[PDB]
Design a protein around this ligand. Structure first.
Ligand SMILES: OC[C@H]1O[C@H](O[C@H]2[C@H](O)[C@@H](O)[C@@H](O)O[C@@H]2CO)[C@H](O)[C@@H](O)[C@@H]1O
Length: 434
């Protein structure tokens, strides 16, 4: 069951994973259960691949938006906290991790992007995106720049795209309408057009990523960046005199960050589920466990009420909640992964000049719709095939299964499984339809 009596933990490399290891060390000394904290690249994409074969980590930390996909694939254990435990965390944080009637993770912290600014270069931060070009020109004559932030992940560019009306999936009357995608509307195009104009007018570079922007801010070379609470401890070390504030408006509208609840899920494949539960409830989600993580890299506004009451007068936390309140909670629905992959490509293509903004966003909308149409078709044709076979209509069953095969990511493995599931002459019939 890879493995044994230890916990492997995956968490992103921008989080306080060393502080999480200290909590793990403590758990190991009270318990004999060794804890290993890892931060693989692209873990949020790795996990479903590896968990679907029955391995990967015992525990996975990510923002709640990925977890309904993982859950709908059966990759996550149900969590079952007792009454007392439930009451210790904020209800709305539990809502971010409730999927099809079950809790599928523990909430840890509420994350939103803020504007971070260097008070020695910009004692008053801009109110508006539209003020940035002029500040940048002024700062350029002094050998500095106004703003650098990660352009390679769409999470960072979302606040601006969404400001004037962009959205992912329409939410209305208690559900998402996955047919109603907001990536390609005029508000989304205005925001992304403003971003591309910043680049064209040399106020930003299309290839800036997390590290380039972090270095430039932490060394005093750019007056502003856009980042989450996790970034604050490196800025503390750098000695920059910084503030954390409300993101600027665009066309008189607030920037609208996507809000994430950092969450800890348990792999359905783990043979260590009770131990993971013990670690999360009795070690991590306590004032001291969160403090150990937070002092390594800040979590933001935490889901544990008792620790969060310690945090509320930190102006950086006030700015985080203010931005979060102008923003929107990410959906946790399985279709979010198609959304992010389409949007990432669009923003990169537009920023680098490989596509126009109009074209980049149209193709994004198209690619979301197609990916979801193909998924629905695969699943329906699988089901239809199985239902026909179970009623004895062998050829029509096989025909549907062949439709499923033609669109599958793994047609050879599907062929292998079907050789084991079908009577040999029904398998022979299937081979003639390939
Ligand atoms: O850029 C797409 C990406 O956005 C979010 O990932 C965030 C994550 O929520 C934060 O905790 C932090 O680590 O930064 C990430 C962005 O680089 C979504 O959660 C994720 O699913 C999505 O791919």
């Amino acid at each position: 069951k890879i493995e044994e009596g230890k916990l492997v933990i995956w968490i992103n490399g921008d989080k306080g994973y060393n502080g999480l290891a200290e909590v793990g060390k403590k758990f190991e000394k009270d318990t004999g259960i060794k804890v290993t904290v890892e931060h693989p690249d692209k873990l949020e994409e790795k996990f479903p691949q590896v968990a679907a074969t029955g391995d990967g980590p015992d525990i996975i930390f990510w923002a709640h938006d990925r977890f309904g996909g993982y859950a709908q694939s059966g990759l996550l254990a149900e969590i079952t906290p007792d009454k007392a435990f439930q009451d210790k965390l904020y209800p709305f944080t539990w809502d971010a991790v409730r999927y099809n009637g079950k809790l599928i993770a523990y909430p840890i912290a509420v994350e939103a992007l803020s504007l971070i600014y260097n008070k020695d270069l910009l004692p008053n931060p801009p109110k508006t995106w539209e003020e940035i070009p002029a500040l940048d020109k002024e700062l350029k004559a002094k050998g500095k720049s106004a703003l650098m932030f990660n352009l390679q992940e769409p999470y960072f560019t979302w606040p601006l795209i969404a400001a004037d009306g962009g959205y992912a999936f329409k939410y209305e009357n208690g559900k998402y309408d996955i047919k109603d995608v907001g990536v390609d509307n005029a508000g989304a195009k205005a925001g992304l057009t403003f971003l591309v104009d910043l680049i064209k007018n040399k106020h930003m570079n299309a290839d800036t990523d997390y590290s380039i922007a972090e270095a430039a801010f932490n060394k005093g070379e750019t007056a502003m960046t856009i980042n989450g609470p996790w970034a604050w401890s490196n800025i503390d070390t750098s000695k920059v005199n910084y503030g954390v504030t409300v993101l600027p408006t665009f066309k008189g509208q607030p920037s609208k960050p996507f809000v994430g609840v950092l969450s800890a899920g348990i792999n359905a494949a783990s043979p260590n589920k009770e131990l993971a539960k013990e670690f999360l409830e009795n070690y991590l989600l306590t004032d001291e466990g969160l403090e150990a993580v937070n002092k390594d890299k800040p979590l933001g506004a935490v889901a544990l009420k008792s620790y969060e009451e310690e945090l509320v007068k930190d102006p950086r936390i006030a700015a985080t909640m203010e931005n979060a309140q102008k923003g929107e909670i990410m959906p946790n629905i399985p279709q979010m992964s198609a959304f992010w992959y389409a949007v990432r490509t669009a923003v990169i293509n537009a920023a680098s000049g490989r596509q126009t903004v109009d074209e980049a966003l149209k193709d994004a909308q198209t690619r979301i719709k197609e990916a979801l149409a193909v998924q629905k078709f695969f699943l329906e044709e699988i089901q239809l095939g199985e239902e026909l076979l179970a009623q004895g209509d062998y050829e029509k069953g096989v025909d549907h299964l062949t439709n499923a095969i033609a669109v599958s990511g793994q047609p050879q493995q599907l062929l292998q499984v079907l050789q084991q599931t079908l009577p040999p002459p029904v398998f022979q019939m299937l081979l003639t339809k390939l």
